[PDB]
Design a protein around this ligand. Sequence first.
Ligand code: MG
Ligand code: MG
Ligand code: MG
Ligand code: MG
Ligand code: MG
Ligand code: MG
Ligand code: MG
Ligand code: MG
Ligand code: MG
Ligand code: MG
Ligand code: O
Ligand code: O
Ligand code: O
Ligand code: O
Lengths: 89, 275, 44
Amino acid sequence: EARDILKRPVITEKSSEAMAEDKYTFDVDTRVNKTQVKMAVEEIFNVKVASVNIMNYKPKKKRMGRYQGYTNKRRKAIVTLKEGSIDLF
Amino acid sequence: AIKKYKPITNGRRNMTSLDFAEITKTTPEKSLLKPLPKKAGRNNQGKLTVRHHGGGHKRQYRVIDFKRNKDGINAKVDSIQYDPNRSANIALVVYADGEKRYIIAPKGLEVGQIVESGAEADIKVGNALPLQNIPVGTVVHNIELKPGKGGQIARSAGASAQVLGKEGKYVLIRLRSGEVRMILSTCRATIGQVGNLQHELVNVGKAGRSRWKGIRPTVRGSVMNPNDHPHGGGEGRAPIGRPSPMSPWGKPTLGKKTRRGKKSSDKLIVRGRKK
Amino acid sequence: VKRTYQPNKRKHSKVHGFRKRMSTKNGRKVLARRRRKGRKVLSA
RNA sequence: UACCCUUGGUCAGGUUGAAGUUCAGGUAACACUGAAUGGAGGACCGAACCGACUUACGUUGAAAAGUGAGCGGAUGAACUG
RNA sequence: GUGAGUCGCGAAAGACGGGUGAGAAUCCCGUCCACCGAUUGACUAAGGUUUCCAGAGGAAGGCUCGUCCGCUCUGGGUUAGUCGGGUCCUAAGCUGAGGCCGACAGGCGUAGGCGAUGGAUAACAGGUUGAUAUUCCUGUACCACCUAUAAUCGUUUUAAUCGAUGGGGGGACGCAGUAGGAUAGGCGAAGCGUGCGAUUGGAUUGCACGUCUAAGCAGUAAGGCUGAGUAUUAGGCAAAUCCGGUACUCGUUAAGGCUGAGCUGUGAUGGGGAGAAGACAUUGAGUCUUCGAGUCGUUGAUUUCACACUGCCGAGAAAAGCCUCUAGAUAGAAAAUAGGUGCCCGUACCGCAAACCGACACAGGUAGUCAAGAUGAGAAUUCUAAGGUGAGCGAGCGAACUCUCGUUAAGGAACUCGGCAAAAUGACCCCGUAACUUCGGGAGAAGGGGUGCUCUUUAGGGUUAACGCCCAGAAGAGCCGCAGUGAAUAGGCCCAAGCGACUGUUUAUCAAAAACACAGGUCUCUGCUAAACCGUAAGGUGAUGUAUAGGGGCUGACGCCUGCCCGG
Ligand SMILES: [Mg+2]
Ligand SMILES: [Mg+2]
Ligand SMILES: [Mg+2]
Ligand SMILES: [Mg+2]
Ligand SMILES: [Mg+2]
Ligand SMILES: [Mg+2]
Ligand SMILES: [Mg+2]
Ligand SMILES: [Mg+2]
Ligand SMILES: [Mg+2]
Ligand SMILES: [Mg+2]
Ligand SMILES: [O]
Ligand SMILES: [O]
Ligand SMILES: [O]
Ligand SMILES: [O]
């Protein structure tokens, strides 16, 4: 379902330029094919073609209390549009 | 024949090698071939058992019908070819039926000569047929010891056996190695010496030409240190101290007999001359 | 010089890896000690 | 690191000029002759690459075995991923 | 703590100005200078794992200082139907149902299966960010597939038509050598833009630029067809119109029949690219809307593009894709058209290095691709483009002493264990070149000579319609300086002897040799699941081998030779 396929949004200067050609940037739950995102984001907003591109990221390090630990895995997915547009801000 | 090579430098002086006058084509039939990795003289395991092999050049398997199994059907011979893995040069054979099979080359074979595999195939060179029917006083190659296997005998370069005579069952034969054996009456064989005769006058000429084959070096025993070989050790050079010159594994070489006298064919063996 | 340990993955996620160990008696025993002793890593 | 296997990659430039071929020469016919062709060699110089011969240096060192000047092999039993 | 504020501060060319800041030889900016340039350059693999970029900070780290960093803190960055890989194949090898063996463990091994450094496989150019690019957009392309639509099929036979899990073809491979056809880039010009010097002089005079894809239509330089076509079939396990064979008509006619292929022409591209201040309200007027405007001809030419051809022999992976043949499936397709559908991994950065291995920000190693200019045979050498760097302590003085380089009259190995080292020779051409010899060589023997720029005259060869463009000789005549391959890179030689025949390998980190091996010789073993061997045994090597073959010992090219003793 949409819920466990879209975990977060993302915003930044990168996405800000991205919204010129009607692009967007979400972060998903991991272990999700590219295609489920298409049909599911379609299911939830009725926006569509301009198919998806996607990446991963390896987890960095961090020290907040002088103990070692890693950040969390991050699979980022870049959505782009041809059919209207969506704003939820 | 063997063509001496003019000395131009040190590593050719005694050199010698073949002329290749019994060849018609160079590139083989794709079909009968079959591939061949190498092992360098060592086991399913990986350990070295036989010494000094490997290092050589790549090659393939040219299949042979040593059985000459299909009988009666006349054949012809439209080509010769070369065979690395044996001294004996090799022939290709268009059977009557369109089949194609390679056979070791008898000396004095003519391309276009025809050769048979049958009982009623009267005697010439090449023809394949049993021992019982053959006359006495004849030279024969590629005998089988057993019906239907594929021959094991006189299969290398040069001449071949002699038939001295026959009972009904079994049948005599004298080899080269000059040694005698009773053979079955019905084993399939053929007639005529083998091809290449001057494979042995080859002065290999230079060290590499053993590696090209390939084989590789063998080190003496009176050089090593005494663990690795019994003769070894010794200040300076090394006379062999002990009697009975030994292998690396004990077990002498020089005169000792290793035929195991319980083997069943020891009755078939008479008049042991060469060994 | 080229010193020992010119490193690589495949020869190290092979031999000292898991499925070798847990595809051999002795290796299973090895793992038993690296569990009984407590460790944060195996196959390394 | 040592061997071995399967599979790939590499080796500037130049010099020498065998077998054989062929043109005439020449014999009864072959041997043999002189040219032109042809381009073999664990062939010759010599950079990459490899190696470690002599020497100096360093020798709580730049380095737990190298550097600089020279040195040998470099189409082969070569080198190496 | 002592040693000691002592050794060291890890090859190297920096200087000045202007800013900043509390504070600067070390930070930013610029100008100059110097360095590499078959590279200290550019691109990727292995490898490491966020080191990448922005904004702040300077407690410790940095071998100094530090306002800075590859250190800290916060935030942020890696986009694929076509790229490397998987949904395709396979060798070596690994695992291996049943199974054979073993005291247990477990060991062997068929079927099959995994496993690439190889085989097949649909994409290109530009633009763009502080940080991503064949991934984004911009344009132009391709493959498979589904859906929709019709010009051909007609027992579901055979025919259009699908087609193997089986049969066949090809895929499919060595090494060396020469020659050739094409382009890459380079070259010097009479086409384009800018600009005329303040040092005597010069004005066709100086400087820079000289392109455009993959894809689709045509052709195409060189090669190939032991050939084309028919009929039959003792075979390719069953079948076969396919293969293979066999007999004939046409063959060497090359007609060019068929095949494959460098690359070229055209469009793609009235487009992108671009030397371009001659462009502003403007941005620091740098800058941007903005218009500027060119594709010519020559010569040179690979180490790139066909293991193609020839030669040699040491006789040169496999399977799949791909194309066919039937057994068979099955009513009966789809030409070219429109539309859509197209997964996972990786992608940042360094990658002859500060980030990899080396405990260090270490003078080491670290496969592969590109590799320009003059000089040169040349990837050699010297100096420079492209571009990158100034090496993470410096300022003084200019003593010993050590090290590294240069020189030294007279003599010239007297030093010395020993001419160790250092110096001398060194390139091209010409003359010439002994002994001995296994006739190949020795032999670059030795020794000896010439080489610069200008002017004149002349041979020439390749390339062209020709012009001129290139290439490298001879002859004379002159000029200069001590010196003409003016610097740099590049053999020291002769005679005699022992040992070894070679060339080769060896004691990784004290020995590279007269040792080891080597082709050859010789003796003995071994009649074939042969001997020997690893193992407990199966099993496997030997060996796709079959006594002109395989194992063991000894000796070491050549040629002269290989004596006596069989008691131990
Ligand atoms: Mg050399
Ligand atoms: Mg200053
Ligand atoms: Mg083949
Ligand atoms: Mg050929
Ligand atoms: Mg990686
Ligand atoms: Mg380094
Ligand atoms: Mg150059
Ligand atoms: Mg003198
Ligand atoms: Mg003297
Ligand atoms: Mg021998
Ligand atoms: O050489
Ligand atoms: O050399
Ligand atoms: O050499
Ligand atoms: O050489």
